[PDB]
Amino acid sequence: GCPWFCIYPCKVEPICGVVYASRCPRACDDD
């Protein structure tokens, strides 16, 4: 299943970008 951090992105980087990369493995299959 996809993590909600990756499903519901935010527009404030790099704090969102860092967590995005770390909390969205290929497991999500890009939704």
Side-chain angles (χ1 to χ4, degrees), residues 9-30:
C10 36
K11 58 271 190 300
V12 55
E13 317 188 293
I15 186 62
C16 290
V18 174
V19 74
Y20 212 78
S22 311
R23 302 298 294 200
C24 189
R26 302 177 57 128
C28 176
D29 197 79
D30 288 79

